[PDB]
């Protein structure tokens, strides 16, 4: 799908979340929710704070 850029680091704080590092290029899986977007980072899926990533369209 689309690609998003991680603006900050973020360690998952819940079972459904995923961890990311600043500069990470994540595959955006679902952006229907305003605060959390589902993504795929090096081998795993989970949500991250939508505000901590930028769309690379």
UniProtKB/Swiss-Prot annotation:
Family, per entry: Belongs to the spectrin family.
Annotated function: Morphologically, spectrin-like proteins appear to be related to spectrin, showing a flexible rod-like structure. They can bind actin but seem to differ in their calmodulin-binding activity. In nonerythroid tissues, spectrins, in association with some other proteins, may play an important role in membrane organization.
Subcellular localization, as worded in the UniProt entry: Cytoplasm, Cytoskeleton; Cytoplasm, Cell cortex
Protein name (database record): Spectrin alpha chain, non-erythrocytic 1
Assembly behavior: Like erythrocyte spectrin, the spectrin-like proteins are capable of forming dimers which can further associate to tetramers. Interacts with ACP1.
UniProt domain SH3: residue ranges: 1-57
Species name: Gallus gallus (Chicken)
Range covered out of full length: 969 to 1025 of 2477
Gene: SPTAN1
